[PDB]
Each structure stands twice: as C-alpha cells, then as structure tokens.
Amino acid sequence: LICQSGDVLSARYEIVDTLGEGAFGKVVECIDHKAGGRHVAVKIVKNVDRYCEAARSEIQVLEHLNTTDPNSTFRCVQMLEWFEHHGHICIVFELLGLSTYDFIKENGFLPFRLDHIRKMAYQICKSVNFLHSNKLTHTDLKPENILFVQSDYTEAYNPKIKRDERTLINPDIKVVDFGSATYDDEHHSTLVSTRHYRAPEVILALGWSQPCDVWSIGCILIEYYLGFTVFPTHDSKEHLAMMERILGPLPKHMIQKTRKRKYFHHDRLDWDEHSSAGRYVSRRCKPLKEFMLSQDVEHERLFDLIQKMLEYDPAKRITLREALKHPFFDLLK
Numbered sequence: 001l002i003c004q005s006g007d008v009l010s011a012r013y014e015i016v017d018t019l020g021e022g023a024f025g026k027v028v029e030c031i032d033h034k035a036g037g038r039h040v041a042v043k044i045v046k047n048v049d050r051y052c053e054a055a056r057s058e059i060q061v062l063e064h065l066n067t068t069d070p071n072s073t074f075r076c077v078q079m080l081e082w083f084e085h086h087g088h089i090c091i092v093f094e095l096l097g098l099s100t101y102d103f104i105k106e107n108g109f110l111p112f113r114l115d116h117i118r119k120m121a122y123q124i125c126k127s128v129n130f131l132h133s134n135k136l137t138h139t140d141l142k143p144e145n146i147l148f149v150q151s152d153y154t155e156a157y158n159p160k161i162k163r164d165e166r167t168l169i170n171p172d173i174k175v176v177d178f179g180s181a182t183y184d185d186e187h188h189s190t191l192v193s194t195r196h197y198r199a200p201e202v203i204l205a206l207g208w209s210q211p212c213d214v215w216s217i218g219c220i221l222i223e224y225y226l227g228f229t230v231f232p233t234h235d236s237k238e239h240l241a242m243m244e245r246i247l248g249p250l251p252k253h254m255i256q257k258t259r260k261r262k263y264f265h266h267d268r269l270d271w272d273e274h275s276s277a278g279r280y281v282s283r284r285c286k287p288l289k290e291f292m293l294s295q296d297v298e299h300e301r302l303f304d305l306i307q308k309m310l311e312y313d314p315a316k317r318i319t320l321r322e323a324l325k326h327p328f329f330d331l332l333k
C-alpha cells in the first residue's frame, strides 16, 4: 500500500488520487492535513538510479528557477518542498489543472481557438525563453508537459461542427517536468525529446542546444491548431520523410555531417515514395501551409512563426527572444 491512495507522506500529505504516470513514477493529488485539508500535487519518483538522479537534477533546477522567479512570472511550476519517502524522492508542487494534451483529448480532439493558442504560445515562449536566458534547455517540451493553471470550462453547442464544445475560462499555463533540463556546461544526452516533438539535429545526432526546444514548440503549436500531430510515426527514417514532405528537403550540410548512414543513400534520404510506407507518408503529410484552416492574416502570421520555428538548421532557427516579438503576438498587447 506504500505510495498508493491512503498512504501519508511526510506525516501530512494523504494520497487521494493519481493524476498521471510517466517513466519517472507518478504524480498524485494529496490532502495536506497540516494546512487545513488544502490539496497539493506530489511527484513520486521510482527508486531506480536514473530516475533518482533526474529528480535530484529537477530539484536543483527548481530551486534555481524558483529563487530567481519566486512569483512564477515566467510560468515555471512552483515547488513547495521535497523529501524522501521509503526510498522515493517526492516533490511537492502547487496543484495545477489538466495538461493541454488531456484538455484536447477530453474535448474530442477539437483544436484550441486561435485566441487561446496565441495566449498559450506566448506563455510557453516566455517561460522557455526564461530557461534559455539562464543557460538551460528543457529538452522535453510537449503538450503533456504544459499544464493549465485552472482547467474550468464552459460548454456551448457549436452549430458549425454540430457538437458541444468546451472552452476554458482561463487558458493560463505553466511549464512542468524539469528532470531532463540541461545546463549549457553539463553533459548532453544523445537522445532527447519525445519523438513527435524531436528536432532534426537530435534525430541525426549532430548535437543540440537551446534551438531543439524551439522546434518542439513549433510542433506543439501545430498540434494545438489541428488537434493532431503532423508526424504520425514511430520510426526515425519515416519521421524524416514526413519532414521532407511538409518542410522540403533536409539541408545537404546536415546530411553530410550525420553518422546515421542507414537513413541516407548518396547524400539523400533513402526513401521509396512508391512503397507502402511511402504511400502512408504521401497520404498523411503535405506542405505545411496546406494545413491552414483559414487564409486570414492571423492564421498567416501563426504559420509564419511555426515555419520559422521548424527551420532545419538549428543555427538559423528563430530564437525565442525573436519569437516573442513576432506579430502573431500583437493582439495580446
């Protein structure tokens, strides 16, 4: 019964629900018996070396970020305390609401309204830019790691789509999961990110830094806009073929540098468009701007920003400092 509902951590936190599970362990909702029964979130990490290590690294990162930004102006999740419980590192957080992934899924994969996307995108870019300004890269940006502060919603019949639709009262977010976050002068893992959000420099093992987060954010924005991924794959070569269909050919210099020679023939993707997998990619993917659902100026500007975030060469890719000035964001000011 340890670390299951009914267990009590640090003599005050009673587990009442499991909020989510990941490779690291789980996050639970607790009643805090020493603070009037108010609820908190507790991240409970497996007693397995690599997860313990990552959790210690997360704690260090959160102590740095939370000391620099004690009011979470830059929207990183607030750690309240941490402790060990039967060999498990436990990190207590402010209780947040649903992830952006869970909200989309619960809404039947309807995409977010553009005005919500603009607010969420700005907040994500502000947050991650704060990390970048502090010599950190998140490395694991995805919708499941962007959480709403309050996920309360209103429901209205939408006569366009002829279904009921949920709309957030407040779309404010925070960025979570710092267990993979890497300082500039620390060891960089070979493979980072969750596949659908993984930058091409990572796939090609060329080395990565802050730009890989910017590629991930571009992928997130597409997902918010469409309600689905443009990279429906679990294979690296296929992922690269999907990129070529959507974004155009990979740059020759990146291809020349890579040691991932299995993906290439001459200095071109080794991909048969007439194969079954080729037909799949041809059917599911198409040039980026063909995905737009409107040609109005606000949609055009969102897609201009996404295209700059999905620049292949990390040295040329837009920085979040530059992104925060993009005209997509003016209606917020």
Ligand SMILES: CCOC(=O)c1c(/C(C#N)=C\N)c2ccc(Cl)c(Cl)c2n1C
Pocket (backbone or CB within 6 Å): 019, 020, 021, 022, 023, 026, 027, 041, 043, 077, 093, 094, 095, 096, 097, 099, 144, 145, 146, 147, 176, 177, 178
């Ligand atoms: C992969 C499972 O992650 C979550 O379940 C999750 C996560 C994590 C982590 N770590 C990542 N999505 C949470 C981080 C902080 C807070 Cl306050 C909450 Cl409520 C979190 N939850 C619910």
